[PDB]
Design an enzyme around this catalytic site. Structure first.
Site, mmCIF file in Angstrom:
data_model
loop_
_atom_site.group_PDB
_atom_site.id
_atom_site.type_symbol
_atom_site.label_atom_id
_atom_site.label_comp_id
_atom_site.label_asym_id
_atom_site.label_seq_id
_atom_site.Cartn_x
_atom_site.Cartn_y
_atom_site.Cartn_z
ATOM 1 N N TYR A 52 -10.677 -4.988 -1.099
ATOM 2 C CA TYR A 52 -9.960 -5.271 -2.307
ATOM 3 C C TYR A 52 -9.036 -6.479 -2.117
ATOM 4 C CZ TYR A 52 -6.431 -4.940 -5.922
ATOM 5 O OH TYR A 52 -5.567 -5.248 -6.943
ATOM 6 N N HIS A 84 0.830 -1.174 0.000
ATOM 7 C CA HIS A 84 0.000 0.000 0.000
ATOM 8 C C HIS A 84 0.888 1.256 0.000
ATOM 9 C CE1 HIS A 84 -2.880 2.675 2.565
ATOM 10 N NE2 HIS A 84 -2.726 3.140 1.333
#
Lengths: 130, 130
Positions: free
Chosen positions: A123, A60
Site C-alpha cells: 500500500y 500505522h
C-alpha cells in the site's frame, strides 16, 4: 471479548495512511507529538489504540472498536483532527510546496491476517513520492 | 486487498449467533436451506460470504465487507431476513414453545485472531439451553 447490549465482540483494525507525497516529516519530536495526538484522538472517539507505529512518511494504527463504530467516520476523525493538531503544534509542516504534508487523501484499512506486513508495504509503495 | 474511492481495504468479520435456547433445529435440509438463504442475503447486502458453518444450534459466518458496511445493520439484515425466509421455507420452525427458534437476540462479532475458535466456543456455551 467485550460485551455490549445484545452483543459480544472483539474488533481490531489496522489503519494506515501516508504523508502527502510521502514527505519524510514524521521524525523526532514531530513523530513524538503525533503519537500523543493520535492517542488522544483515538480515546476521544471511543477507540482503543492498541498499537501505533509512526514512520517518517506514514502511520500505522491498530484500533480496537465497537460494532457501532463506522470506519470512514473514525478515519476522517483521526486524519482530520491529527492534521489540525499537528499544524498547530508544528506550523513548519504547513508547506504548500508539499501540499501541506498532512495527509495523503487515501487510507488503508485491514483486519488482521498473515499478510498484514506485506499489505502495508504494498500500500505505501503504491503511494508515489513526488 | 480491494481498492475503493480514496481507500484500500480488506475487512473480514466472523459473525456468530445461536437459535433460541440453543434448540438443535438447524439440521439436514433445514441446515442446507439456511446456507442457501444466508449466501443470498450476504450477496444482497453487498457482502462476500467467505465461509459458513451451520451447527445444529448456531451459525458461524465469515464475511468480507467494505469500510462503509455497518456491522449492526448487516447483522440485523442477516438475522432478520434469515428468520423470515426460514419460517417461510420451514413453517415447522414456528414453535412458540421454543420462542419460535429463530434466533437468540445476541450476536458475536470478531475480527480474526489465534483465539477465534475458543471465543466462539465461550460465546455459544454462554447462551443457555432450555
Amino acid at each position: 471479548m467485550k460485551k455490549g447490549r445484545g452483543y459480544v465482540y472483539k474488533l481490531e483494525y489496522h489503519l494506515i495512511w501516508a504523508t502527502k507525497y510521502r514527505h519524510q516529516v514524521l521524525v523526532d519530536e514531530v513523530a513524538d507529538g503525533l503519537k500523543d495526538i493520535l492517542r488522544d484522538i483515538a480515546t476521544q472517539n471511543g477507540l482503543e489504540l492498541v498499537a501505533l507505529e509512526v514512520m517518517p512518511d506514514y502511520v500505522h494504527l491498530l484500533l480496537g472498536a465497537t460494532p457501532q463504530h463506522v470506519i470512514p467516520d473514525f478515519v476522517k476523525a483521526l486524519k482530520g483532527a491529527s492534521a489540525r493538531r499537528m499544524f498547530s503544534a508544528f506550523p513548519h509542516l504547513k508547506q504548500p510546496h508539499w501540499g501541506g504534508n498532512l495527509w495523503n487523501p487515501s487510507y488503508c484499512v485491514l483486519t488482521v491476517s498473515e499478510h498484514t506486513r506485506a499489505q502495508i508495504q504494498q500500500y505505501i509503495e503504491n503511494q508515489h513520492a513526488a
